[PDB]
């Protein structure tokens, strides 16, 4: 199961609405049924003159393990979209492993407003794709997304009823790490 070839960013989106503060994933849809562990995620993306750099956190809800990353790449000219390389870091943002240039993720913004966003992520590890991942984002953990963002979900051809909500998973976040 490859990522979809029919994902594009919403035109007209204000990048300022996306590159703000920290995001928490409130809801996710992973199209590959083979993927079984559920994660919580939070991240803080920043942009300067077309370069994106972001600090990312995952917590595996089933195992109570976590990992940290720093991603970096360039904004596409065509819309709010980037393909990032990523390194592995500790909680103090020291590098553990430099980026493997055979791996990347492509993040496409589908909607963003002051409180909420919807993004699509295609993670690739060499040959292999992870399958489509859709994440509904809010700035406050366990808040509901806006009506505008919920509309974006339907308009992406999805149903919110199918998403996993993270607020009931027993997440632990490292809010020190995502506060820049």
Smallest separation (angstroms) from ligand HEM to the CB of 180: 15
Q: Name which position in 25, 122, 136, 152 contacts ligand HEM (CB under 6 A).
A: 25
Closest CA to 51 of 26, 16, 83: 83
N- to C-terminal Cα separation, the chain: 36
Task: Describe the chain by its helix, strand, coil percentages, rounded to 5.
Answer: 15, 45, 40
CA distance 106 to 53: 13
Q: Per CB under 6 A, does 68 bind ligand HEM?
A: no
CA distance 79 to 50: 11
Smallest separation (angstroms) from ligand HEM to the CB of 160: 15
Q: Per CB under 6 A, does 35 bind ligand HEM?
A: yes
| Site for ligand HEM, rule CB under 6 A | 25, 28, 30, 35, 37, 39-41, 43, 56, 58, 69, 86, 103, 105, 107, 121, 123, 125, 130, 135, 166
- Binding-site residues for heme: 58
């Amino acid at each position: 199961m490859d990522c979809s070839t029919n994902i594009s960013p919403k035109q007209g989106l204000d990048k300022a609405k996306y590159f703000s503060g920290k995001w928490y994933v409130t809801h996710f849809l992973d199209k590959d049924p083979q993927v079984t562990d559920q994660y919580c995620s939070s991240f803080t993306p920043r942009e300067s003159d077309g370069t994106v750099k972001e600090a990312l956190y995952h917590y595996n809800a089933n195992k109570k393990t976590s990992f940290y990353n720093i991603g970096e790449g360039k904004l596409e000219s065509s819309g709010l979209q980037y393909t990032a390389k990523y390194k592995t870091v500790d909680k103090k943002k020291a590098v553990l492993k430099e980026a493997d240039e055979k791996n990347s993720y492509t993040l496409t913004v589908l909607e963003a407003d002051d409180s909420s966003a919807l993004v699509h992520i295609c993670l690739r590890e060499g040959s292999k794709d992870l399958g489509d991942l859709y994440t509904v984002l809010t700035h406050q953990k366990d808040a509901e997304p806006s009506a505008k963002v919920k509309s974006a979900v339907t308009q992406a051809g999805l149903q919110l009823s199918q998403f996993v909500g993270t607020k009931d998973l027993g997440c632990q976040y490292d809010d020190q790490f995502t506060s820049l």
